[PDB]
Design a protein around this ligand. Structure first.
Ligand SMILES: Nc1ncnc2c1ncn2[C@@H]1O[C@H](CSCC[C@H](N)C(=O)O)[C@@H](O)[C@H]1O
Ligand SMILES: [Zn+2]
Ligand SMILES: [Zn+2]
Ligand SMILES: [Zn+2]
Lengths: 245, 15
């Protein structure tokens, strides 16, 4: 079974597709990070001719791109700025698929060039108090999958209840994606980017570098020759540590 | 207490 991202826009149909096991369980689809408690480049503007020639606005040499900052609407290249991927939701062509043992996952629907933006990891941003509260709730409920992503010291992203299809990217000890933290509007966001050419049909993975606070570690089924056997690796850390101190 | 659980940690890929 597989589904495209558009399938998640229709809740009623998503829900009944889920009853027949045709789509993953329902969660709240959001366009950007939601906080539980709240807290310009020097590119030379492309001519119309360069635009027509296929020149890239704010490409490799953009001072903002280089520091992993997105441009605003006030960018010198304006509409044509190619450095506003997070804000324009310019995700890769990706599908959500049911895997053998890891639950649902992500898969390339087209070839994906190296260093291609895939999706933003959206969710509810928690502080330490909120994180601890949800650690308990998720344990009480006996959740299997976990969706905590460290953003900064007092900010963890939690896509358990709210997020987008990025919450489906499985771990691999030998992955074809990575996280990159991007500054968007003075706020930090995390997004997945490919680390290499990913052929169409290939599953999309990143290395969790998982900080396990659980008593028992989950077994990893990535199937790599360098697989570490478990998510979190050898060590178990405290709750506060996983949570960023 | 928690039987399972953990936090994913962003890092740049390095071979
Ligand atoms: N390589 C792997 N081996 C075993 N389980 C994995 C895995 N990678 C991801 N998972 C599972 O996926 C969770 C991460 S959230 C990823 C989405 C999840 N697969 C789902 O269908 O909802 C983890 O808690 C873990 O249970
Ligand atoms: Zn620029
Ligand atoms: Zn720009
Ligand atoms: Zn593995």
């Amino acid at each position: 079974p597989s589904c495209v991202m558009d399938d998640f826009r229709d809740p009623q149909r998503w829900k009944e597709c889920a009853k027949q096991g045709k789509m993953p369980c329902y969660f709240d689809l959001i366009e950007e990070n939601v906080y539980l408690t709240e807290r310009q480049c020097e590119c030379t503007p492309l001519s119309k001719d360069e635009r027509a020639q296929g020149e890239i606005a704010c490409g490799e040499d953009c001072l903002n791109r280089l520091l992993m900052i997105e441009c605003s609407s006030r960018c010198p290249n304006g509409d044509y700025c190619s450095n506003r991927r997070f804000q324009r939701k310019q995700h890769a062509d990706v599908e959500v698929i049911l895997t053998e043992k890891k639950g649902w996952g992500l898969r390339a629907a087209k070839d994906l060039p190296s260093n291609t933006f895939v999706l933003e990891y959206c969710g509810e941003v928690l502080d330490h108090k909120e994180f601890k509260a949800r650690v308990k709730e998720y344990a009480r409920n006996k959740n299997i999958h976990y969706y905590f992503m460290a953003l900064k010291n007092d900010e963890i992203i939690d896509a358990t209840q709210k997020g987008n299809c990025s919450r489906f990217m499985n771990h691999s000890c030998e992955p074809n994606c990575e996280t990159q933290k991007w500054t968007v509007n003075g706020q930090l966001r995390v997004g997945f980017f490919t680390t290499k050419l990913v052929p169409s049909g290939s599953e999309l993975t990143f290395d969790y570098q998982f900080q396990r606070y659980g008593k028992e570690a989950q077994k990893c089924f990535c199937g790599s020759a360098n697989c570490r056997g478990y998510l979190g690796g050898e060590n178990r850390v405290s709750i506060r540590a996983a949570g960023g101190k | 207490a928690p039987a399972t659980g953990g936090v994913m940690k962003p890092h740049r890929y390095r071979p």
